[PDB]
Amino acid sequence: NVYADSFVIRGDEVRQIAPGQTGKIADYNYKLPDDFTGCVIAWNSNNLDS
Amino acid sequence: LSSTASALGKLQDVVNQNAQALNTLVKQLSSNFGAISSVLNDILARLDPP
């Protein structure tokens, strides 16, 4: 089975959403494991979200 | 036996060889092996988990 998590984040912070990264969002909001973590998919939804 | 110096060399050499092996083993801990430092706690302190 597979789980999918979803959130909206800023471009510079997308870089933080990776295994082994650190930063305000990776540390406080959503700590990705320091292990396997599957694919991270991101697209620029500025039209809808902004 | 009292006078000659190298009479017991055969036993003296085995004790010396064992002591040398142990000392080289211990002195090896201070070696770097290409890591940024030779102390576990130092490395854990100065760099991030990954």
- Check CB contact under 8 Å for B48 and A20: yes
Residue A31 to chain B, least CA–CA distance (Å): 13
Contact A40, A17 (CB under 8 A): yes
Contact A13, A27 (CB under 8 A): no
Contact A14, A45 (CB under 8 A): no
- Dump the DSSP string for A2-20: ---------HHHHTTSSTT
Which residue's structure tokens are 């030779």? B38
Q: How many CB pairs under 8 A join A and B?
A: 7
Query: For residue A17, how many other CB atoms are within 10 A of its CB?
Result: 19
Which chain B residues are Cβ-neighbours of A20 within 8 angstroms? 48-50
Q: Is A9 exposed, middle or buried (CB count within 10 Å of its CB: 0-12, 13-18, 19+)?
A: middle
